[PDB]
Amino acid sequence: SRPVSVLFLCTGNTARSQLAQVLLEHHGGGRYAVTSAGLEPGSVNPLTVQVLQESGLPTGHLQAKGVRPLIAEHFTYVITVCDRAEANCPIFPNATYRLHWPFEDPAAATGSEEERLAVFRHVRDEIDARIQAWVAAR
């Protein structure tokens, strides 16, 4: 049985959408074909990598990538993980369902590395929870 296609959509594809991609890869297994992309791609935040690796989740395949090369693709679910109020939080044209799971931008948090890592861990855990519940309802 072929997998359900999911695009996690964000601003820079550096944090929330990368966390979501890896967490759905983990909890969903082969049931989902998972992509993440951003409107204005940056670079995966090192704290994104750190908090995933702390959980034993691999990150070597993560790359910040733009949504423009995907504009002709269709996804059964497009799940926007930036707040629509954020600048460069985009919309995607080809989807069956558009879900909006705004999460706090962990990369916007300030303070020491340890204080920022705490925010990244909190957002990781929130995304993890939402993904577990979403997979379980299917």
Residue numbers in the entry: 6 to 143
Task: Tell me, in the authors' exact words, what the paper reports.
D. indicus contains the typical arsRBC operon that encodes two regulatory proteins (ArsR1 and ArsR2), two arsenate reductases (ArsC2 and ArsC3) and an arsenite efflux pump protein (ArsB). In order to explore the difference between the two species, D. radiodurans and D. indicus, to the arsenate resistance we analyzed the arsenate reductases that belong to the ars operon, which are able to convert As(V) into As(III). DiArsC2 structures are composed of an α/β domain and four parallel β-strands which are flanked by three helices and two small helices. The reduction mechanism of arsenate involves three cysteines, Cys15, Cys87, and Cys94.
